[model samples]
Target chain A: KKWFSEFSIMWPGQAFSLKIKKILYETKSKYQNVLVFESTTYGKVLVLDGVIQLTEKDEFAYHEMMTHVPMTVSKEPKNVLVVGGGDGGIIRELCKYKSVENIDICEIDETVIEVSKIYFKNISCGYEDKRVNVFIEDASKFLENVTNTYDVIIVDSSDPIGPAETLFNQNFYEKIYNALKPNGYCVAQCESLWIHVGTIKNMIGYAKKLFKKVEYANISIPTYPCGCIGILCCSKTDTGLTKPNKKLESKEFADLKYYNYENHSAAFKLPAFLLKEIENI
Target chain B: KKWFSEFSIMWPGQAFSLKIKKILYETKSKYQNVLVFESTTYGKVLVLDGVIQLTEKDEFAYHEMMTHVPMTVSKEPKNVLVVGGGDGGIIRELCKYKSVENIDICEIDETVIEVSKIYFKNISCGYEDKRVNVFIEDASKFLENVTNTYDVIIVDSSDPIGPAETLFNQNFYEKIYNALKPNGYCVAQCESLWIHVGTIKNMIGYAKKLFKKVEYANISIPTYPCGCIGILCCSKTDTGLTKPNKKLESKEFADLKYYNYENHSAAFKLPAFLLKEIENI
Candidate 1:
C-alpha cells in the first residue's frame, strides 16, 4: 500500500497539494465545495469551492492582517463587521482587541462555520466568545439598511467566483460605506495578486469611488494561488492606515502568528513590481 | 479519460502541483534530478532536485532581489560572481547595472545551464552579454582559491539539499568573504524564512562572524516552498543595505518585474512573527 496525495485545483492550471493522512470529510454544500483533511503537513485543512479557506499552521497570518490593519486605522473601534469569515479565524483575531465591544460576523454559509467548528477547532473557537454574534445570511443585504454602524468592516469572502462575487459590486461597497460609523474602514480579502490581480484592480476600481482613502495590502499564504494574497482596505474617515489608532501592546497579540505594529505598517508595503504597475492609482 | 496531475514534494508534507500540459523534458543530470514542465499556468518551469527552481512568469521577483539588493549596497559594483545560478536569472538581473563590468558565474553542473538556455531562453539570455563569463566548476572550490576579488557575489542555488548544500556551510561563507574586495557584498538565495528559518538563522550565525554587515532580505516568489525566498546579504563594510549607493535612474530597471527604490527598502521587512524569532541574531 502507498500513501497518496489530496489536492484542490486553484484555477485552470495551478493547484495546491498536501500529502494526505486521511480525509476527515468531503461533500458539497449549497454554497460551495467544503472539505476537511487531516494532512501530513499544515495539520487540519479546510477547503471550500475547491479553494483553501485556511490551514491550521498559517491562518493567524491572514486573520491578524485582516483584522489588525483596519482595527489599527480607526481611532476607536466599538462595533465591527466580518462579512464572510466562516472559519472564525477573523473573529478569533478580533477577540484580542479590548476596544472592540461588538463583533457581528455575517457568514452567509452556516455549513462553513459548522465544518470549521468541528474540524478546525483552534480557528473556530472564537465563535464561543460572547461578544461575537453570528448571522448567517447574504452580507450584500446585511448592511443595506444599517447606517452609521461599524468602526471596522472586514470582508473575508472565499473568492470572487460564486456568492462572494456579489460582495465586490459597487452597490455592496456603497452600503459598506454607509454601514460604517464615522472614521469607519473596510479591509477585504481581495484575492491573490498572482492569480487575481485583475479582480483586485476591479475591486479597487469600485473601492475608490466611495472611500476617502483606498490602498492595497498583501500577505503570504503558502496554500493560496502563487503563495500570496492581496488585500484592499479603504478608510471612511480621514485617518491613514499606516498608524493604528491604538497601539497593541505585546501582551495582547500573544496568540497571533503574525501582525505587530511594525508588521502592520510593513504589510501595506507592496513589491516594486506591483508598486510600479499600481502606482498613483 | 482524465489527465492525472504530476507533483513535486516540496518538503516533508507539502507539494506544489500544476496541471501538466505535458512534460517538456525530464532527465537526470550529474549534479541533480532535473525536469521541465509545460504547464497551464506558469508556462515552462525549470525544476532541479525535486524543487521548483523558477517559473517563467515570476522569476524576475526572485532574480531582482537576489541581484539588486547587493548591487545597491555597494558604492560601485564592477566585479561580481554568481554561484550556482545556472538558470541565468541572476545574471539577467545583473546586466541592468551600468557600473557592473565583469560577472563570472560558477555552476557545478553545465547541463543545468544547457537546460535553462533552451527552455528558459528569456532568463538565460543574460549569458550572451559581453560582461558575463560562465565557469563550469564547483563554486565552493571556485571561490576558495580567489582573494579580494569581486565587489558582489550572489549564490542563487537550489534548496539547502543535494549538491546545493555545499554552498551554505560556514567555510563556504568564509571563502565567499575571502573572494570579495574590502567593500564586497555577497547575497545568497537563502532558503525561505517561513520553512527554513533555522537554516537562515544558522547561516546568519556564520555570515555575521565574517562580514561586518549581515541581514536577511526576502522577495515573494510564488513557485518556491513558502511562496517567498530569503536572501542573505553580507557586506565587508559597515554600510547598511537599505539605501542604494547611487540611486537608479528609472530605465536601469525598466525590464525588471520587481525591485524599485521603495521596495528595495521594503524587501528587508519581514513578518513580525518571523522577525521576533530571527531578529535577535
Candidate 2:
C-alpha cells in the first residue's frame, strides 16, 4: 500500500482526490471552473466547478485556532456563536470552555455536518452536547434575527469567495458586531497572509472600523495549500485577547492531539514582516 | 502572464524547474536528500538541499532554545565550545551571556563558512567577535584533542545521519563528557520529536548515562518538513544555567528576530507526552 493509502485507511472519509478543468468564471466572491477525479478516500471527490474547499479532517486547525484564541482572551466567556463551521470543530473547541453555557452553531450545509459526525468524531464532540443548538440556514439571516447576546462570536467560514462570499462583506461583519454583547470578542479564519495580504488588509480595515480593536495572528497547518494560516481577532471593548494568560491551562477533553494554551498564545505572535503589515493597517 | 511566470520574474530563482536539477544535486551534501526552496521578494531565490540548514532568518528559534535552556540551568557559564555551527548562529546566541568569555567553534565544512559569509552575513556576526576562535575541521577530532576544562560544550551539529552523524554517537558523547569541566552542561539539536522518536530516545539514553540530568524540548520551524524540531539539554552538575541577567537589557541585541529570555525558558516546558517519555527514561 502507498503512503496516502495508509493515511486514508487511518482517516476514512476525511481524505480524497480531485482534478481540474477550464475556469467557468473568476471573481473576488467566486472562482468557478470544471473538474473531476476518483477518490478512494471520500467517494467521488466532487468539483462542481473548479473550486477547492476544506474537507472534514482539514477543518480542525482552522476551527481550533479561531475559537480557542478568543476564548483564551476572554476572562469569563458564557455564550458563543459559531458561523459557518458545519464540520463542528469550532463548536467542539468552544465546548471545551467550562464557562460556556450556550453554543449556537450556524452552518450552511447539513450534509457537511452529517459527514463530520460520521468521519470526524474528535471534532464532532460538541455536536452531541445538550447546550449546542445547530442551525441549518444562512448565518447572516440567523444573526439578523437573534437579539440574544453572546460573549464570543466565531466566524469559521471557508474562503470569502464561492459559498462564503457574503460572509466577508461589511454588512455581515456589522451584523456579527451588533449581535454580540458589549464586551464580546470575535475571531475569523482569514485568507493566507502571503497571497491575500491586500484582501486581509481590507478585511482588517473593515473590522477596525466596526470594532474598537483588531489584531491578526498565524497558525501552521500542513494540509493547507500554503504552509501557514492566518486569523483575525476583533473586539468591541478594550479587552486584550492576544495577551498570554497566567491562569490558563489545558483542560482534559478526551485527550487533545493538539491545541494547548502555550500553542494558542504563541500562535498570535506573528513574524516581524507580517507584524509590520498588520500594524500598517 | 500566469502566476508562476509573474513570480519568476519578481523573484528570478523563485520557480524551481527541471533545468536547475543538476545545480541543486551538486550543491547538496551526499548525506541529505531533501531540497528546500526559499524565495525572497528581491528577485533572489536560494535553493538549499538540506533544510535551509541554518539561516539567520530562522536561526534564533533554534540557537536560543538550544543555548539559553542549557545556560539557564548551568548557573554561570564561562567557557563554551560550539561544535559544527559553521554559520555562527549559535555563537551569536552564546555571546548574549556576559559570563561567556572564550568560545571555540569547530566546523568541518569550510564551504559552509564561505557560503554563510557571502549569503548570510547577519548570522556570521558571531564569528567576528574577538573572543571566538574558528577551528576549520571535524568537531569530533577537535573534541578529542581538547582538554576537559570547558564549563559548557554545545554540539550544535547538523542531522545525525549525515556528516554530523559522529557528533550523535556514543563515542563522541563520551568524549564530550570527558572534555567538560566538573558540573559542566551540554546541549545539541536532536531532530524532530515526531519523526525521530527512536533516535531521540536513544540519544536521551546515552545522555542520561553521561550526565546527571537529561531533558529535551521542542520548537516550531515552518521550513522543516515536520514543522517541529527538538533539542536535548544535559548537565553533569546538580545546578543548571543561570537566570537571565537583569543587566541583559543594557546589552540587548536589538537585531534579533526570534529567541528572547522568556522564550528560552519556556522552550524547556515540553508537551505532556514528551515530558512523560523523559520521566520514563
Candidate 3:
C-alpha cells in the first residue's frame, strides 16, 4: 500500500500518483533528488526532484518521438547531441539509426545516469553503442566552445521547475543553435501545451529569433502531467520540418512502437485554439 | 484540506488527484454517484460514479472532438442521438451545427442532467436550444424500438465500470447500429488506448463485423485517466470517417477550440505500435 505522488506548484493542485510495488533506489544527487521505483502498472518509474521523468510502460511514446521525429527530418543525421536525457532512452533511440556516426549526450546529473543504467537497463541500452559518447557536464557550458558540429540536436530535458530550468530560456537555445550545423534540426521537449503554453510560447519566441524555422509537435505519454508533452522542432535552414525528409527503412520502422510516418506530420497539427493561442509567437 | 483522487481497478495502481477548493455537491442518483467540486487549477469538475466526467478547463477538447468529428462527416446531420452525456457538453457541441435539427439525448441518470443544469450552466447551455429533447431512460432500452431513425449517434457514456458497463459490449454496439440510418455514422467514447488496449481491440472486433468502416481517433484531455481518450468512429456505408466530407463555414469553424480540418484527418493517425496492436481487429 505504498504510493508515489508527483505534485508541482507549477501545475498546482494536480498530482499523478502510482502505487509503488517497491522503492528501487532513492538519493539526493549533487544536482537533484533521484528516485526509481517499481510501479505496479507502469513498470519501473523514474523521478527527479519529485517529478516523474519516464515510466517503463509508456517511455517509448516520448523517447521515440523525441529522437526519431528530428532524426528522420534531418535526412540521415550523422551526428547528434542529446541534452539532459540521463536515462539514455534518447541515446537508445539514437542508436537505431545506423547512419548516426557520433551520439553525444550531456547530462548534468551523473547519479541519474548511473541509476538508470542499473534499474532501467533496457531503456538505457543505447549507452552500449560504440558511437555514443557520454559527457558528464551541464549542456549550457558544454556547448559554449562547440560550433557547427551536430546534424541534429535533441534536448530531452525535464520541466523548467528544477535543474532543467536553465535549459528552457533564450541563452540555452542560442547555444543549441550555434552548436548545430546550418542544415541541422533541433528537437527539444517543451513541456505540455495545456499546462505550459506561456513557457512554450516564450521558448518558441527565442527559437524563432535564432533558427530559420520553428514548429511545435505533440507526443502522447500517459504518465506526464497532462498525459501529453510538446516537442519544439527548430531548423537552422528554411525547411519545413512537419514531414520527414527521409522515410525510415521498413526494418528501422518496424522497431518503433510509436512515431510513425503519418504521425510525424500529424504531430505538428495543433488544435484551432492552440494555433490561435500561439499565433502571435 | 481535501483532495479528489480517482483510482480505478481498470487502470490498476495509478491515480489522478486534484486539490479540492470546495465540494459543491454530492449525491447518489438512481444509477450512480454524482459529485461536483471546484479544483484549484482545473476549475469546476464533474464526477460520475467516482470517475471524472469533465472539467471546466479541458472539457472542450473531449466534447468538441466527440461532437464535431462525426457531425462533420454525416453531411448536415438532421437528427442526432447522444447517449449518456447528460451534462450537455456534447449537446452543447451538437447545438453549434446549424443544420442539426432534432437533438435527442437519452440519459439513464436524470440526476446527472439536473445537477449539470444547476452546477454547470455554461456546459449545460445546450438545454436551451429548441432542437434538444431530453429522455430519462437507459439508451440500450431506448434504442430497442428505434431503427434507422438518426443520421448520427454518439455514445458519450462514462467508463465501463458501473452505469456505462453495458455500453461497451457488442450488443450495445449493435443497438447503436440499429439506431442509426443505413448511411449514418456512430462515434463512441472508447477508453484510453494505453490502459484498455484489449477492450478497444475487442470493441474494434465487434465493430468491424458490423460496420462498413471503423476508425479510431485520439483526443488530449488531462483530466482523463491517461490525459488522453480514444474515440471510435464507425460508418454504415463504406466511406472514410477520418476526414470531414463537408467543410464548416468560417463562423462555425471559429467557434471551435479544437477539432480542425487538418486534425480531423490527423486524429485517426495512430502510432506504428498501436496500428500493429489493432491491425488484426
Candidate 4:
C-alpha cells in the first residue's frame, strides 16, 4: 500500500519504486540532501541528493569493488586516500588489508559521516580503524594539503553533480596522479554503463591521457543506477590492471562479500556491443 | 507530468513505475497472455503472462547469452533445439553460427510467435532460416516425443509458473539429456538469483543427478527480475563448461552484441555472497 518512488540516471528512461514502511530520517545537510528509510524487501535504504547511494541489501557489491580491486592490484598498498567517501563502507573494506598502514579520508561535509555513523552502525565500521584519519575539508583541497605520497587513492564520490562534480574532472584526476607514488593506482565510481555510456566514454578518454594504463570495470549493485555501475581504474604503469598483483588469502576472500581474484580479472570484461560503441576510450 | 508503469520480479516486494503511456496491445492467447506497447524511452515492449519478456532497448543481453554460451562450449554445436523461444531472438543469434546447420524450435503458443513476427520484425528473423523447423506444441511434449538428439538445446522457458511450470522438472531435464548428443549441452533461462536462490539450488540439485556437469551463470538485464537474470547450463560430459571449444571467427565475433570469451568465462562468476551461499551449484 505504501509506494516510495525512486529514480536514477543509469536507466535513461525509467525509474524504480518500492513498497517501504516509513522514513526514519530526512534532513538537508550543508553539502547535500540526505535521507534514510526502511524498505519491506531491500532493508535499510540510504539516499543522497535524490539518488540511491547504497541500500542495506546490496552495498557490499559497491564497497568491495571500490576498495579491493584498486588495493589488491597496487604493489602492497601501505598508504591509502579515500576522497568523498563519507559512508565509511569503503574504509571498512580497506580495513581488511593487512598491508595498508595509513588510511586518510577527506569529506567536505561532516554531517554525512555523522548521519552514517549513527544510522548505519554495522556498515560504517571504518571509524574504528586506528590508521584512518578523517579530514573535514574538500577532497581536492585535502589532497593539495597533503605532503606525503599515497600508494593508492580511491575517489568514492557521488554522481557527476553538486559538491562532487569537481572530482570527475581531469584536473582533479591530475591532482590524484600527482599525489600518488610511482605504481599507485585509483578507482572511482563512474556512472552506469547502460545509461550515460557516452559520458563514461568521455570520462575514460580524460583518464587515458593522464595515466599510462587506464581500464574500466563494473559490478552489479541492484540499488545503484540501473542496477548496474562501472568503475574507472587507472595505473601509473603500463602493466595490465585486470590481474591481481598480489594474491589474497582465503581468509581475506572469506571477509569479502562481493569481489574475488577471478572476478577481479573478469571485471574488465565488457560485452562486445559496448566495446564496439565505446572502444575502451 | 505523466506516469507510464513498468515492473520486475526481483523487487517482488513492489512494482516499478514509468512515466508516460499505457498498453498499446493486450490479449489472452491460447497458451498465455501476450501484449505489446510502446514507451517514450524503451520503444516497443513485449510482455507474456504478466511478465516482461524484453524491451526494445535490452533484448540483446538475454538473447546473446541464451544462444552463444551453449553454442560456444558444445564442441561446435551444429544441431540445436530451442524450447519456448517464440520471439526468434535466439534463432536470429543461432543463424550467425556457420557451423549450426540445423535448429528446431518448439513453442507451445503460436500467438506469441505470430504477434512477435509482426510487432518485433528484426527479432523474428529465425523464420527465414531454411534449417529451422518450428513445432507448435508444448515444449515438454515435444522434447518427450523427439527421437533425434541435438548438440545443443536451449530451454528459454518463461518464469516457472502456469504454462511453463512443467519445464523446470528433473524429468524434463532428463528428457533433454536424452535428446542431446554425447558431448551435448544446454542452457535454460533460470529465474533471478535474488528472488529464486532456493529455486536455483533445487534446480542445480536436480540437474547434478541428471547431467555430468552443471553450472550457473547470469547477466544483467535491467528490465528483468531484479535487474538480473540467471542461466543454468548443463553438460553431458565431465569437461568444464567455462571454455569455448570452438574459437569464434572474427565475423562471428562481430555478429554478437554480448557474448565473448572473457565474459564466457566470467559469466560463471557470481558475486561473493552468492558464492558462499550457493557454492557452485
Instruction: Give the alpha-carbon lDDT of every model.
Output: 0.79, 0.63, 0.88, 0.82
Cα lDDT tens digits, model 1, A178-274, are 8877677888887777776666777888888889888888887777777778788888665658667566675767656677776676667786656
Alpha carbon deviation, residue B39, candidate 4 (Å): 2.2
Query: Candidate 1's residue-wise lDDT over B74-183, tens digit each?
Result: 87778999999899999988888767899899999999999999988988999899998888998877887655398888888776668887877888888887888877
After best superposition, candidate 4 residue B182: deviation in angstroms? Answer: 2.1
lDDT of 4 by residue, A1-281 (tens): 57667765445457776667778898998888888888888888888887877788788888988888887778778999999878899998898887789999998889889888998987888898899999999887888779999998889888887788788787888888899998888888888777777878888888888898878898887776567888888888898478887766757557677888888878888888777777645
Best by lDDT: 3
Q: On TM-score, who's better, 3 or 4?
A: 3
Q: What is the lDDT of residue A100 in candidate 2?
A: 80
Segments in model 4 whose C-alpha atoms lie over 4 Å from true places: A8-11, A250-253, B1-11, B18-23, B250-253
Assess each model's interface with DockQ, reporting 2 decimals per model: 0.69, 0.12, 0.88, 0.67
User: Clashing residue pairs, candidate 2?
Assistant: A33-A50, B71-B241, B72-B241, B73-B240, B73-B241, B74-B240, B74-B241, B75-B240, B75-B241, B75-B242
Off by over 4 Å in 1: A1-10, A279-281, B1-10
Q: Please, what is the TM-score per model?
A: 0.94, 0.72, 0.98, 0.95
Give one digit per residue, the lDDT tens place, for model 2 in A41-125.
3222223223334433234555666766788777788889988876677888777777789998888767667655655566677
- Candidate 4: Cα lDDT at A143: 80
Candidate that beats the other on TM-score, 1 or 2, i.e. the better one: 1
